[PDB]
Enzyme design. Structure first.
Site, PDB file in Angstrom:
ATOM      1  N   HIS A  15       0.788  -1.383   0.194  1.00 17.55           N
ATOM      2  CA  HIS A  15      -0.097   0.068   0.062  1.00 17.55           C
ATOM      3  C   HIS A  15       0.890   1.494   0.190  1.00 17.55           C
ATOM      4  O   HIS A  15       0.501   2.167  -0.706  1.00 17.55           O
ATOM      5  CB  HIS A  15      -0.957  -0.017   1.485  1.00 17.55           C
ATOM      6  CG  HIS A  15      -1.998  -1.230   1.010  1.00 17.55           C
ATOM      7  ND1 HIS A  15      -3.084  -0.768   1.292  1.00 17.55           N
ATOM      8  CD2 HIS A  15      -1.739  -2.624   1.092  1.00 17.55           C
ATOM      9  CE1 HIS A  15      -3.881  -2.141   1.282  1.00 17.55           C
ATOM     10  NE2 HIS A  15      -3.176  -2.970   1.032  1.00 17.55           N
ATOM     11  N   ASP A 112      -6.991   3.837   4.248  1.00 18.32           N
ATOM     12  CA  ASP A 112      -7.291   2.281   4.370  1.00 18.32           C
ATOM     13  C   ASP A 112      -7.852   1.918   5.741  1.00 18.32           C
ATOM     14  O   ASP A 112      -7.358   2.592   6.572  1.00 18.32           O
ATOM     15  CB  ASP A 112      -6.209   1.524   4.078  1.00 18.32           C
ATOM     16  CG  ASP A 112      -5.764   1.274   2.734  1.00 18.32           C
ATOM     17  OD1 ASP A 112      -6.570   1.086   2.021  1.00 18.32           O
ATOM     18  OD2 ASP A 112      -4.355   1.447   2.403  1.00 18.32           O
ATOM     19  N   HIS A 346       2.436 -14.140  -7.562  1.00 19.16           N
ATOM     20  CA  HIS A 346       1.319 -14.748  -6.681  1.00 19.16           C
ATOM     21  C   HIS A 346       0.161 -13.833  -6.973  1.00 19.16           C
ATOM     22  O   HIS A 346      -0.763 -13.994  -6.379  1.00 19.16           O
ATOM     23  CB  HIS A 346       1.654 -14.384  -5.163  1.00 19.16           C
ATOM     24  CG  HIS A 346       1.972 -12.642  -5.059  1.00 19.16           C
ATOM     25  ND1 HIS A 346       2.654 -11.873  -5.710  1.00 19.16           N
ATOM     26  CD2 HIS A 346       1.127 -11.991  -4.115  1.00 19.16           C
ATOM     27  CE1 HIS A 346       2.717 -10.597  -5.178  1.00 19.16           C
ATOM     28  NE2 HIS A 346       2.006 -10.694  -4.021  1.00 19.16           N
ATOM     29  N   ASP A 371      -8.207 -11.013  -3.032  1.00 13.07           N
ATOM     30  CA  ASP A 371      -7.720 -10.235  -4.048  1.00 13.07           C
ATOM     31  C   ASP A 371      -6.771 -11.063  -5.186  1.00 13.07           C
ATOM     32  O   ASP A 371      -6.870 -10.745  -6.209  1.00 13.07           O
ATOM     33  CB  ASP A 371      -7.068  -8.939  -3.467  1.00 13.07           C
ATOM     34  CG  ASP A 371      -6.966  -7.833  -4.810  1.00 13.07           C
ATOM     35  OD1 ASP A 371      -8.060  -7.595  -5.203  1.00 13.07           O
ATOM     36  OD2 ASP A 371      -5.920  -7.453  -5.008  1.00 13.07           O
TER      37      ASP A 371
END
Ligand code: RUT
Ligand code: U5P
Length: 454
Positions: A15, A112, A346, A371
């Site tokens: 992030h 967030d 990934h 996600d």
């Protein structure tokens, strides 16, 4: 007129990095950015500040919470099972956050997770902007109002189907829906279940925003806007900006010895450890292809060094053609290097973008995260830009032969599926890098923020 925006991202490299890419894009347009970051982490972030006269870091002290390792600041400092405690810590920065807002008085704060923030900001006359750097398809699938109202009736079979009105169709495997059903009720900070947090954030914020563009993320942003009745913005795809640190010469030298397009690069982020069995299958699968490879992996669960955990004889066989390495590396600079022909990923949101804007063939190996999984389905089945490694339906495990197969298909010039994903990747790359795509995304973005503070 230029805005003053405060940034309050989650305590994770995944992030901090995109929030910083976007801050540079906003400061280029004249906006002032107050960037709240954990204190020790700021050192690692300076290399990305390209406008230090407009972007100012304000450090935060990550408070102790029982069970949190001493000095820990981000998810790179703690195992994945300790994420909820780090969240409790981020909740506990509330006092220093109110002080910072009072002294700095921004017009907007991007944030967030911290659903207590909109109450504070409206009392100060600040607008709250919940800004996601993950896929809106993910929030849409798990956290739209239709899922929330079943509350505790939501089960594994329920999560094999999209919520009511969801704009697209993809299939989850049984083990993936089981992951989503159990993890959504796990407490993530201060006793709040994971999906309930997020839903609170979506419900209480002034506006919502996502990394992305209309051509890919649009259908999901539209659905969320009709569901929650407030503006859902798109920042543009947040194309990575250039660091002020060149590529480490140790890697530049070693990569430079391989012929263009021949190397397999494999990395699964900085948040996870494989189990030793899957660690072996992955590495033996890479070895079976015969291509040179660089695998950036933590040592498997229970092990503390890579060398301890390598399959027997592995180092003596692969010799100079392969490296398995545990440190943090300059992934964006590696993906740009002409030796890299294939990216085993990934499917984290940042790694996805970094792969899309480069030439490497994509092999999708999503790890257990909502996600990641939804990124992989979209990438594999909708955009068809990469090949996903087959997993067991119920157990979620792969074989070395499935890894070998996926890499071989995309590296084979004469394989028609490899040719198709290459062509589809080129189409998506050409759109993301189009001379006016990101600029006109940000044009609309900034107009809509201007409306928000008006
Ligand atoms: C252990 C993990 O915990 C949860 O994810 C935690 C992770 O959330 C990721 O970001 C995520 C956010 C999120 C992001 C930003 C926000 O402001 C916010 O409110 C939510 O929301 C999700 C919602 C889901 O339904 C499923 C998900 O996988 C995610 C998710 O990965 C972070 O990038 C990671 O650093 C973090 O470790 C999920 O339950 C996940 O499936 C599970 O595997
Ligand atoms: O050794 C590493 C591991 C990760 N990353 C970066 O960390 C972020 C991980 O984000 P995500 O892919 O998990 O979303 C990406 O920007 C990725 O490039 C690195 O730079 N080096």
């Amino acid at each position: 007129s230029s805005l003053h925006i405060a940034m309050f991202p989650w305590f994770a490299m995944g992030h901090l990095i995109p929030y910083l890419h976007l801050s540079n894009k906003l400061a280029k347009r004249g906006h002032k950015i107050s960037f709240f970051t954990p204190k020790k982490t700021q050192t690692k972030l300076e290399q990305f500040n390209l406008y230090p006269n407009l972007i100012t870091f304000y450090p935060l002290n990550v408070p102790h919470v029982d069970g949190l390792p001493f000095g820990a600041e981000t998810t790179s400092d703690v195992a994945i099972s300790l994420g909820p405690i780090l969240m409790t810590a981020m909740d506990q920065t509330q006092n220093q956050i109110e002080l910072l807002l009072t002294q700095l008085k921004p017009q907007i704060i991007f944030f967030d997770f911290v659903f207590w923030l909109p109450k504070i900001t409206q009392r100060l006359g600040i607008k709250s902007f919940l800004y996601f750097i993950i896929n809106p398809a993910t929030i849409s699938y798990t956290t739209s109002p239709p899922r929330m109202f079943e509350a505790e009736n939501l089960t594994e079979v329920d999560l094999m189907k999209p919520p009511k009105g969801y704009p697209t169709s993809f299939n989850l495997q049984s083990h993936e829906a089981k992951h989503l059903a159990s993890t959504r009720k796990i407490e993530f900070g201060s006793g709040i279940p994971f999906s309930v947090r997020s839903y609170n954030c979506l419900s209480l914020t002034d506006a919502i925003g996502f990394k992305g563009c209309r051509e890919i993320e649009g259908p999901y942003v539209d659905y969320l806007q009709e569901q929650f009745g407030k503006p859902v913005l798109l920042s543009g795809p947040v194309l990575p900006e250039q660091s002020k640190t060149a590529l480490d010469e140790k890697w530049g030298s070693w990569l430079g010895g391989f012929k263009d397009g021949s190397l397999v690069y494999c990395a699964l982020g900085s948040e996870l450890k494989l189990k030793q069995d899957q660690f072996h299958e992955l590495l033996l699968g890479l070895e079976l292809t015969g291509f040179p490879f660089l695998a950036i992996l933590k040592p498997p669960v229970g092990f503390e060094t890579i060398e301890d955990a390598l399959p027997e004889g592995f180092k003596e066989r692969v010799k100079e053609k392969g490296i398995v390495h545990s440190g943090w590396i300059q992934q964006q600079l590696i993906l740009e290097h002409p030796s890299v022909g294939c990216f085993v990923t990934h499917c984290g949101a940042g790694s996805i973008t970094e792969g899309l804007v480069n030439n490497c063939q994509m092999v999708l190996l999503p790890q257990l995260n909502g996600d990641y999984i939804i990124n992989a389905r979209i990438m594999g089945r909708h955009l068809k830009v990469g090949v996903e490694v087959k997993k067991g339906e119920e157990d979620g495990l792969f074989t070395k032969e499935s890894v070998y197969e996926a890499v071989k298909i995309v590296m084979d010039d004469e394989n028609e599926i490899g040719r198709e994903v290459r062509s589809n990747h080129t189409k998506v790359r050409n759109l993301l890098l189009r001379h006016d795509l990101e600029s006109s995304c940000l044009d609309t973005f900034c107009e809509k923020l201007q409306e928000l503070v008006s």
